[PDB]
Amino acid sequence: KEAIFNKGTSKRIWNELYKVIDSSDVILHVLDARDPLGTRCRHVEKYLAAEAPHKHLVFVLNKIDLVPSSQAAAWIRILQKDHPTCAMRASITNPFGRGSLIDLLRQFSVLHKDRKQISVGLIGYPNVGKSSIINALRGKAVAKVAPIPGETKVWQYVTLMKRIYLIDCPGIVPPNQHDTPEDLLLRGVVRVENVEHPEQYIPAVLRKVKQHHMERTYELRGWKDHIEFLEMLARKSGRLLKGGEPDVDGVAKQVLNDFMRGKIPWFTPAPEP
Amino acid sequence: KRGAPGGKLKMTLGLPVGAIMNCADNSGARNLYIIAVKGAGARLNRLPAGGVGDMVMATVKKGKPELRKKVHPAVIVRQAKPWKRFDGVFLYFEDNAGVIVNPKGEMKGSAITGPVGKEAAELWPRIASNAGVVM
Amino acid sequence: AKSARASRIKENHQRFKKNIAGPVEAARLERLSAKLMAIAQASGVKSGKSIGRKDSSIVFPM
Amino acid sequence: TQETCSEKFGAIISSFPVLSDQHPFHRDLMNILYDADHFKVALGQISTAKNLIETISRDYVRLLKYAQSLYQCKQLKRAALGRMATLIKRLKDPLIYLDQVR
Amino acid sequence: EEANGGAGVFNVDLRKDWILENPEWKYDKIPEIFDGKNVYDYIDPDIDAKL
Amino acid sequence: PQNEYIERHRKLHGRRLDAEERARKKAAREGHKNSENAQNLRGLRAKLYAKQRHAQKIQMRKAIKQHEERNVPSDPIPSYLLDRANPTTAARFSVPIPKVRGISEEEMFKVVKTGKKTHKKGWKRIVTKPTFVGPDFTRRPVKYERFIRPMGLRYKKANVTHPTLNVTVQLPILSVKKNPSNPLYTQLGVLTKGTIIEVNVSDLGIVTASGKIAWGRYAQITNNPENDGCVNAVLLV
Amino acid sequence: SHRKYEAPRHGSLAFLPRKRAARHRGRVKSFPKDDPKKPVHLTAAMGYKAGMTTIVRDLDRPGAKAHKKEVVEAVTIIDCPPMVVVGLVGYIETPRGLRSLTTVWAEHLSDEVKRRFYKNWYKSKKKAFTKYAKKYAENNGASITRELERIKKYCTVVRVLAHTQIRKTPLKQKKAHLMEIQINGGSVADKVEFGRSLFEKPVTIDTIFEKDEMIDVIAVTKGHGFVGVTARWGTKKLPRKTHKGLRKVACIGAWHPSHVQWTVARAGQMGYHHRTSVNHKIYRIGKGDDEANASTETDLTKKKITPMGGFVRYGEVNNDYVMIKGSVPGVKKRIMTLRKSLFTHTSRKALEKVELKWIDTSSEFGHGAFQTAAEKKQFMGTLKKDLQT
RNA sequence: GGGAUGGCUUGUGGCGGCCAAGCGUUCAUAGCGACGUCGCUUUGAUCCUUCGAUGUCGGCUCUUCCUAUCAUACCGAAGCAGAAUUCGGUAAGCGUUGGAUUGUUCACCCACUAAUAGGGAACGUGAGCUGGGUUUAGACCGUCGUGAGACAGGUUAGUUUUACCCUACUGAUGAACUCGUCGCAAUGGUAAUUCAGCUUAGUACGAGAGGAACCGCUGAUUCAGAUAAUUGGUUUUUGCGGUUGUCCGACCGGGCAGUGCCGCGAAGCUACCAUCUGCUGGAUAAUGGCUGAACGCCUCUAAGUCAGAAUCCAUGCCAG
RNA sequence: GUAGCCAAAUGGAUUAACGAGAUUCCCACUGUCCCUAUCUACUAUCUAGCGAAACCACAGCCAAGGGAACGGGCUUGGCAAAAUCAGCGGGGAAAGA
RNA sequence: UGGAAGUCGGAAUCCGCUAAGGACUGUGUAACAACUCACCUGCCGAAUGUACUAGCCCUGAAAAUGGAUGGCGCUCAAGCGU
Numbered sequence A: 001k002e003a004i005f006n007k008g009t010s011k012r013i014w015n016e017l018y019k020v021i022d023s024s025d026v027i028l029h030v031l032d033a034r035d036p037l038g039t040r041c042r043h044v045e046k047y048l049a050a051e052a053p054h055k056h057l058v059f060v061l062n063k064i065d066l067v068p069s070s071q072a073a074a075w076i077r078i079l080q081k082d083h084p085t086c087a088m089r090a091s092i093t094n095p096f097g098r099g100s101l102i103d104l105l106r107q108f109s110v111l112h113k114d115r116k117q118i119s120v121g122l123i124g125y126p127n128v129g130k131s132s133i134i135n136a137l138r139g140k141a142v143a144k145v146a147p148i149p150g151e152t153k154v155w156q157y158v159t160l161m162k163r164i165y166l167i168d169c170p171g172i173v174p175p176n177q178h179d180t181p182e183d184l185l186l187r188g189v190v191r192v193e194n195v196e197h198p199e200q201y202i203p204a205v206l207r208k209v210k211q212h213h214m215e216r217t218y219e220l221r222g223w224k225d226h227i228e229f230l231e232m233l234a235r236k237s238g239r240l241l242k243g244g245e246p247d248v249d250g251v252a253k254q255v256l257n258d259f260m261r262g263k264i265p266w267f268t269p270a271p272e273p
Numbered sequence B: 001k002r003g004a005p006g007g008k009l010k011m012t013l014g015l016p017v018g019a020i021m022n023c024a025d026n027s028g029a030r031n032l033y034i035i036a037v038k039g040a041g042a043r044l045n046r047l048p049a050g051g052v053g054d055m056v057m058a059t060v061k062k063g064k065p066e067l068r069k070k071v072h073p074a075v076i077v078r079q080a081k082p083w084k085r086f087d088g089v090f091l092y093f094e095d096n097a098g099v100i101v102n103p104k105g106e107m108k109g110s111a112i113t114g115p116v117g118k119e120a121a122e123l124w125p126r127i128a129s130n131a132g133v134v135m
Numbered sequence C: 001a002k003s004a005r006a007s008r009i010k011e012n013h014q015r016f017k018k019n020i021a022g023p024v025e026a027a028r029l030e031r032l033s034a035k036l037m038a039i040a041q042a043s044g045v046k047s048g049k050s051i052g053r054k055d056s057s058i059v060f061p062m
Numbered sequence D: 001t002q003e004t005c006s007e008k009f010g011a012i013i014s015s016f017p018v019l020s021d022q023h024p025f026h027r028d029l030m031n032i033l034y035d036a037d038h039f040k041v042a043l044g045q046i047s048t049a050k051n052l053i054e055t056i057s058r059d060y061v062r063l064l065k066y067a068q069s070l071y072q073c074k075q076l077k078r079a080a081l082g083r084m085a086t087l088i089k090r091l092k093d094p095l096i097y098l099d100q101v102r
Numbered sequence E: 001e002e003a004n005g006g007a008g009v010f011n012v013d014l015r016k017d018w019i020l021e022n023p024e025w026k027y028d029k030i031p032e033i034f035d036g037k038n039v040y041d042y043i044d045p046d047i048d049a050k051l
Numbered sequence F: 001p002q003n004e005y006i007e008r009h010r011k012l013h014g015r016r017l018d019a020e021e022r023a024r025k026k027a028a029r030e031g032h033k034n035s036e037n038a039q040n041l042r043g044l045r046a047k048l049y050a051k052q053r054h055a056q057k058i059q060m061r062k063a064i065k066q067h068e069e070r071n072v073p074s075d076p077i078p079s080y081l082l083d084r085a086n087p088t089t090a091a092r093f094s095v096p097i098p099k100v101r102g103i104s105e106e107e108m109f110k111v112v113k114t115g116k117k118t119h120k121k122g123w124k125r126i127v128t129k130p131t132f133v134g135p136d137f138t139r140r141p142v143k144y145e146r147f148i149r150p151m152g153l154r155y156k157k158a159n160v161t162h163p164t165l166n167v168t169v170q171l172p173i174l175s176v177k178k179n180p181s182n183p184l185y186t187q188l189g190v191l192t193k194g195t196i197i198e199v200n201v202s203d204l205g206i207v208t209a210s211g212k213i214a215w216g217r218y219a220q221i222t223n224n225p226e227n228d229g230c231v232n233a234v235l236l237v
Numbered sequence G: 001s002h003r004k005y006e007a008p009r010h011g012s013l014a015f016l017p018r019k020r021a022a023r024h025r026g027r028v029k030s031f032p033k034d035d036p037k038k039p040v041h042l043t044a045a046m047g048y049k050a051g052m053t054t055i056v057r058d059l060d061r062p063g064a065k066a067h068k069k070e071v072v073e074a075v076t077i078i079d080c081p082p083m084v085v086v087g088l089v090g091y092i093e094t095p096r097g098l099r100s101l102t103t104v105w106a107e108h109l110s111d112e113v114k115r116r117f118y119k120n121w122y123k124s125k126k127k128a129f130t131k132y133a134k135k136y137a138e139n140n141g142a143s144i145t146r147e148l149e150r151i152k153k154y155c156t157v158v159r160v161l162a163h164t165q166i167r168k169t170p171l172k173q174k175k176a177h178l179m180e181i182q183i184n185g186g187s188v189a190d191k192v193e194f195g196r197s198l199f200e201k202p203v204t205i206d207t208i209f210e211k212d213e214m215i216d217v218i219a220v221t222k223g224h225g226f227v228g229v230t231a232r233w234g235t236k237k238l239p240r241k242t243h244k245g246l247r248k249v250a251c252i253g254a255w256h257p258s259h260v261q262w263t264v265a266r267a268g269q270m271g272y273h274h275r276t277s278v279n280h281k282i283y284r285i286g287k288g289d290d291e292a293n294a295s296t297e298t299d300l301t302k303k304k305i306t307p308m309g310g311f312v313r314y315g316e317v318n319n320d321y322v323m324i325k326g327s328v329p330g331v332k333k334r335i336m337t338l339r340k341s342l343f344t345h346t347s348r349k350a351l352e353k354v355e356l357k358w359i360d361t362s363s364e365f366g367h368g369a370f371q372t373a374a375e376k377k378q379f380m381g382t383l384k385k386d387l388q389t
Numbered sequence H: 001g002g003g004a005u006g007g008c009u010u011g012u013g014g015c016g017g018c019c020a021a022g023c024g025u026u027c028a029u030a031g032c033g034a035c036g037u038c039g040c041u042u043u044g045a046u047c048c049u050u051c052g053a054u055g056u057c058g059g060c061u062c063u064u065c066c067u068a069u070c071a072u073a074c075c076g077a078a079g080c081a082g083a084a085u086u087c088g089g090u091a092a093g094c095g096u097u098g099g100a101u102u103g104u105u106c107a108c109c110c111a112c113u114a115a116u117a118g119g120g121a122a123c124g125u126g127a128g129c130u131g132g133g134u135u136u137a138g139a140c141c142g143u144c145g146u147g148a149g150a151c152a153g154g155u156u157a158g159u160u161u162u163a164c165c166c167u168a169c170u171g172a173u174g175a176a177c178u179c180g181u182c183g184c185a186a187u188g189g190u191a192a193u194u195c196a197g198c199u200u201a202g203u204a205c206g207a208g209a210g211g212a213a214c215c216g217c218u219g220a221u222u223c224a225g226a227u228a229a230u231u232g233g234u235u236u237u238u239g240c241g242g243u244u245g246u247c248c249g250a251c252c253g254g255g256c257a258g259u260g261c262c263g264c265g266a267a268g269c270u271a272c273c274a275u276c277u278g279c280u281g282g283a284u285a286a287u288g289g290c291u292g293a294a295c296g297c298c299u300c301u302a303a304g305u306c307a308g309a310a311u312c313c314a315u316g317c318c319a320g
Numbered sequence I: 001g002u003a004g005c006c007a008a009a010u011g012g013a014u015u016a017a018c019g020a021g022a023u024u025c026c027c028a029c030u031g032u033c034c035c036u037a038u039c040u041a042c043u044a045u046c047u048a049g050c051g052a053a054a055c056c057a058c059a060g061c062c063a064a065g066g067g068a069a070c071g072g073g074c075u076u077g078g079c080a081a082a083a084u085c086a087g088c089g090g091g092g093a094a095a096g097a
Numbered sequence J: 001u002g003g004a005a006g007u008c009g010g011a012a013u014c015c016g017c018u019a020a021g022g023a024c025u026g027u028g029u030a031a032c033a034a035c036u037c038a039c040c041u042g043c044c045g046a047a048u049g050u051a052c053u054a055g056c057c058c059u060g061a062a063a064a065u066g067g068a069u070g071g072c073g074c075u076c077a078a079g080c081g082u
C-alpha cells in the first residue's frame, strides 16, 4: 500500500489533535455536506464522550452550496439528534450561517463568563473547510486556505472576539480497517498528483456521479466504460502524448481533482426516516 | 525453492532494476516493470540486474487491470544488450522482453510471440515447450 | 560453505593428490626427465679431489 | 524488549490451530483430546499478556520522554522490564499446557 | 558410468555406436577447414563424375 | 509417523549400544563439570550461574531439614470463610512518613525557551514530576500558560493499601491535599513521596458510626512516582 | 560512531606497497619442494611474450554445460627460444637461511650473456670471464673440480644458471636474460653431474614443460605511472562539481589517530608490479622448425602461429612457442618466467587433455577476416597492380 | 572586557503484609534478614481512546576496532522420524543489500538475500562536502502590547574565499662501501567468500504428505590480482569520405567557422559492458574421548594423552 | 431539488491575463545514477629569465601515566640514519575568527 | 482408573518375621514381571564423616588505535605474612 494513504494518521498530526482538544473548551467538528457520515469522526467522539464530558462538541456541516437544500436540511435533522448542528458556507465575501455560528459561540462564552475566555478548536478530515470557517467567522484571511489537502500543518490561534479564541488544527483521518484507498481518495485525504494509476478510481467517480451530470460537465456522451470516457475526454481536450496518444493518466487526474474541488455535481442522499 | 536457476553461465546483464520490458506472452499484460532480480548479491550502491533466462519480480504498468495490482515472477527471454555465448558469438535482440511465470516456472499465459533466447529455453522447460522459435 | 583452509577440504584434496593427480604428474615428470637425459648425455691437493680452501665477524677481535 | 515479547507471543498465537475455523471432525477431536475451554483460555491469556506488555511499553516510553536524569531513566527502564517480567511470570501453567499440546 | 568414476567424471564415447562402412574409421578426425573453405560444403557423393 | 512413534521405536529396537554407559559417565563427570563452571565462567553468565546454584543449595537444605523433621488458619473465621484465600491481617496523629527529601524549584521546574532569535525568552516552566490536574480540566492557552503539566505525566488512580485490612486496591484520586515541599507544588497537584492525597474509598467498604458511607479519605504517597511509573499510597487510619 | 551500511574494502593489503618492481626480470621467490626419489629435472624456464590470439577447443569436461561442444577461448603466445646452461650454484642450509657456497661457470660464454655484465658493452674491452676461462686449462681444471666436489659434498640445493638466446627473437635488445633454475629430484651428486653434463648446451622448452600441464607465470605488470585513487584503488567517484576535486577520497581521516592511516587509499604509482600468477594451462607447445604448427587435426590449412601481418609491436615467432590459456601479468616483448606448480593439482582441469580444432591467425592490426594471404587473394581476386606487374 | 558526571554503565518494578536459614538477644525478646510468597497495577478480544521539540539530527566518501554473533564453520540439548527449526556454547576469519515514504521527532513498510547483527573511534564542546535544530540585515500572516517592538508561532530569500610551511601518509630518487651480475631472508604486510545445480536419490526416514547427508562433479555471488585475442565505448590518426556558409575567377587543390558539423575509423587506453586466475601444513577453543589418581565406587585431568571451528601461527603471495 | 425558490444573463473571491515569485506531478530527455572509461586545450610538471606574500616563542614520530578530564618539552616504554622530488588534506598552523 | 499390583493420582502409612527391609528411592510393564535404592549380613582392615572458621588462589561483567605492578622480567620468587 502506498504511503500517501497513511496521511492523516501520523503521530505528529494526532499529537497536534490532542493538543488542540486539551486546549479547547468547544470543539467544532466539521463535516462535508456531500458525505457527512463519511467525514464523521466517531473515534474522536468516543474519546470526548469517555474522557472529557466537559468539552462541548458541535457539528458544522460545511459546503452546503454543493448539495440540495432539502438534503442539507435532512442531514441537519439527522445530526441534531446527537449534537447541535450548524450549516455553513465558509467564505469571506459571501458566507452563510456566520451569524448563527457567532451567536452560538457567544452563548458558550456567556455560559463560561467565569473564565477569561473560551477556546474553540476545529477538527475534521482534511479539506473539509476548517480554515475557511475560521476565515469566514473572522471576515479576514487569517488562516491559509487551499484545495490541496493538508494545507494546515500546525495548530494556530486566531482571536475572534475579546473572549473567543479559535484553534485551527491539521486534518486527521482515524484508522478504520474497512476503509479502502479508493474510499480515502474519494473522501479527499490525499493529493491525486502523488498517487499511482489514477485510472482505477474513475469507476468509483462514475458510480458516485449521475451520468447526465458528467455529460453536461464535459460536453461528452456515448462512452461504455471509464477507459473510453477518458480517451474521448483526452482527444477532445487535446491531452495528447507523443504521436497523438491520449493522456489518460492526466485526464484521470483532472477528473479526480474536479470531483474533489466541487466542479462535478455529486452528493450522498440522506437516509429516509 | 527460490527462482534463481542453476547451471547458468555468466552473461552480460542488460536489464537493471527500474527497466520496462515488453511482455512476450498472451497473459494480458503489455509491459513489465522490473523491481527485483532473483539471486542478486549484496553490494553498496549496486542496482540488481538480470539477463536472458533470469527470473525477476515484475509489475505490470500497461495491461489488464486484473494483472495491475500484483507482483509477478517473470523470466527474461530477450534482451537488447549484446552478450556472448560460449561459442564466441556476441548477439542481441531488438527489444527487451519477458514472460510471466509462477515460482515453480510454469507459464501464466498460453503462447509466446516472437523468438526466445537459448538460455531461457534450457533453463525453463515450459518456455521451451511454449516457444515457436528458439533462437 | 566450507573454506579453503578447512580441514575436511584439505583431506579431500590430499586424497585427490595421492590417488588421482599423482600418477599422472609422475608419468609426465618421467617423460620430461628422460628427454632431458637424452639432451644431457648427448695427489688430492694437486688434483682437486681433496677439497682445500679457496684462493663483520662472529668473534670479538683478539 | 516489547518487540521481542510481541514477536514470541504472536508466533505462539498464530501457530496454534483456530478451533472456530476447523472442520467439525478436527474441532471435536481437539475438544476430546484437549479441553477446548482450557485451550482457548490459555491462548487468550497469551494474547492478554501480549497486549498488556505493549501497553506497559507505551506508558514507559511516554514517561521516558519526560525523564530528566540517568538515574530516573534507569529506574523507569527497570520498572518497565520488571512489570513485563511479572506479566510473563503469571503465565507459568498455560505455557506448560501449550507445550504439551504442541 | 558407476564403474568408471561416476557422474561428472565418466567420459562417454559418442562415436561408439556409429554405423560406418569400415569400423576402423569410427575414431577418425574428420576434416572441417581447408584453406578458408568448408569441407562439408564441398562434400558431394557424386564428386568424381563432376570432377 | 503418528502418536508415540519414538517410544514405539524404543520398544522395537532400543537405544544405541553405549547410551546407558555414556549417560552414567556424564552423570559421574557432573561434579567436575560444575566445579569447572564455578571457577571458569566469566561475567553475567557466571553471576546468573552463581545465583542459580545458591537457590538450589537453599532448596536442598530445606528439603534435607524437612526430611529430618518428618518424624515428630490463624484468625477465627466461620465455616463459609474456611478454606478460602484470606489476607494474613498482620495521641500523636503522625503520618507514616513525617519527613521526606526536599525538592528544589530548580529540580521541579525546567525552563522552556521560546522565540525565534538566538537569545530566547525563558518565562515558561515545565513540571518534571507526575501531577493530578483534577476533573473538568481545560488547559490554559499558550500565551498565558506559565506552568506546563504534560499530558503523559498526569495520573488519575493510585494503588492504595489499607494497613489494618492488608488489602491493596486501585482507587481514584480525588485531590492533592498537601505537598510537603511547597504550597505551589500542592496547588499544581504534584504527586511526590510523602504527599497527602485524597482518595475515593468506596470500594473498601467503610461506614461511619451513624451508618453513613465514607467515600473520601486521606492517603500518603509512599514511593517515587517519577521513578516508578505508578502512585503507591497508604491510607491514614 | 559506526559506519551505517557495511561495504567490503577497496583493494587488498596482500600487495603492498604499490611501488615499482625492484627488477625488470621476474624473481622466482619459491621453487617446488625437492623430492630426492624423483628423477632430476629443471623447475623453470624463460620466454618472451609475443601477443594473444583466439582458438576453438573441443571441450571434454563431464558435468559442464559445454561438454562435447566447441568453446572459443583466449590464449597468450610466448616465444621460447631454447636456453643455454652456463653455470651451477650450490646452496647450503644455515640458521640464517639458504646461503650460496660457490658457483661454477662454463669455459665458453656467449657475447649476449657477457653483455649482461656491462652497461657500456660497446666501449668495453669485453674482458669478462677471460681469466676464469684459463682455470679450465690450468692443472686440468683442478679448481673447477674442487668447486664441483664442494657443491657435491656440502650443498643441498643445486641450481643451473641459464640464459636466453635473445638474438633469435625480433627484439632490438641484444643483452640476454640470465636466471637460476633449480634442479629438483635425485641426489646432490646427481644434480651436480647433471649440471656439468648440461654445461654449454641448449635446453628447449618442450623438455621442461609439456602440453596439458598447468604452470605459473612470473612477470612485471604493465606500468601506468602516477594514478589517482579512483583508478588506482577502485574508489567511488564524488558527485559532479565537488569542491577541491571529485576523483578523490573525501575523508582520509575522521577519527583518532591524529594521523593518516597506511590503510587509506592514496594516489601514487600504478602498475609495474611483480606478480606470480598460478594455474595456467598449456594448450600447445609448437615447434620452431614445424611450418604447420598452427594447424590442427581438423584444420588442414598449413600455417604458422604468427598472425597475418605479424604480431602487433612484436614481429614474427620463429622459435618454439608456448600457448597458454588466458592472460599473463606482463606485456609484449617482456621477459616471462614459467615455473612448475609448487603443489600437486586438485582440479580436473589439470587432468584434462586439450584438443584444439582451430587457431586464429588473422590480423590483429584491424578487423582481419583472412587467415592467410592466399585466402585474402582468393577472396579479393585479380587487382589492378596484378596486371600492372 | 570576560567565557565557551567519569574503574560512571548492562537482565530481571514499586509499595504493603507474611514466612524465613541465619545475625543478634537470651537482667529487655526487641530489632536486621537473603531465599521466597501474597495483594494492586480477552474462551486467542477489540480495532469507535495515536495524550506536548527547551535540549536535534542526518546523508555522502572512506578506514579501522569491539563482541554484547544476524549469516557462514564446528559443537551440546529438545517428539529433534525426515525436512524445517528452537534453546545454548566456541568463535569477529568473512559478509551484513536494493528501494518507496518530509501535510515530518523522517521513522515505519516492501522486496532481494546466506543474512540483511549491534556498537565505538564525534555526539563527556569544537575548519573535508552538503540538507534540517538555525536564528544578522529585506518581507508577509497569527498572538500579545497604545507604540517602538516582543513572540505560542507559520512562510519566503539570503558573502568566508588556505596550503607553497612542519609532521603524518602515498609514491619517486639518492651520498658514503670500485663497478656490476646472480642470490639469501630478518622484519613488516597477507585473502578469499557465499550460494546453486548434477550425482548420491525420490534413497535413508515416513501412515501419508513429503524428504536429506558424506565422497565425487559443474557453475554462479561478493572480493582480489591481472589482461586486451574477441565484442562494445572512446577519435587530433584531424586517416578517408560526405556536407553548410564564406574566400582563393571556375575545376583541381585548399583556408577560415578556436576540432564548423556528420559517417566510418586502425592504433592506444579501456568495461563482470570483455576475458583469465585465486594455492596447504602444524597447533588449538567449545566439545567428544583413552588410560588413570585424588576419594578401596567413580571420574576426559591431577601426572600422561587422542581427536577436533571458517580460529591461531606459518607456507604459497607482496615489499626487501 | 440527483438539482429549488427569489432577485436586473448571473448568484461570483474556486477572479482571467502577466511573473528570473514559492510547491507537487506527467510526457519527452538524458553519464544524476548502476559504473565508470576515453579524447582535446590551458595549467599543474621540467628548463631559461623574473620573482612575492600570509605566517613564524622555540620546535616538530608515537604509546601509557602526568588528580584540577589539557600536553609538544616531564616519567616509563616503543624506537630511531644524510640529503631530497611530486602529490595529499589526518594533525599543528590557517576564517580582515 | 479402560487398565494402575510400592513406583499416572488422592488420603492414610500399621503389624508380623526380623539380622534387616519404606504400605517404597529410582529404572521398567498396558498391567504384571524384572532390575535398583533405603536397611541388614559375610569378606577386608584403622581411622573416618558432617557443618562451620581463618589464610592464599579462581569466578564474583567487559567494550572498542597497540601498552603497561615504571619497564624488563620474576614461580622452594624478584609474590604474600612475621
Ligand SMILES: Nc1nc2c(ncn2[C@@H]2O[C@H](COP(=O)(O)OP(=O)(O)OP(=O)(O)O)[C@@H](O)[C@H]2O)c(=O)[nH]1
Residues within 6 Å of the ligand: A062, A063, A064, A065, A066, A088, A089, A090, A091, A125, A126, A127, A128, A129, A130, A131, A132, A133, A144, A145, A146, A147, A148, A149, A150, A151, A152, A170, A171, A262, I014
Ligand atoms: N463550495 C464550497 N467550498 C468550500 C467551502 N468551504 C471551504 N471550501 C473549499 O474547501 C477547500 C478546503 O478547505 P480549507 O479551507 O483548506 O480548510 P481545511 O478543511 O482545514 O483544509 P486543510 O487545511 O487542508 O486541512 C478550500 O480550498 C475551499 O475553497 C464552502 O463552504 N463551499
Ligand SMILES: [Mg+2]
Residues within 6 Å of the ligand: A129, A130, A131, A132, A144, A151, A152, A168, A169
Ligand atoms: Mg485548514
Ligand SMILES: [Mg+2]
Residues within 6 Å of the ligand: A126, A127, A145, A146, A147, A148, A149, A150, A151, A152
Ligand atoms: Mg487544504
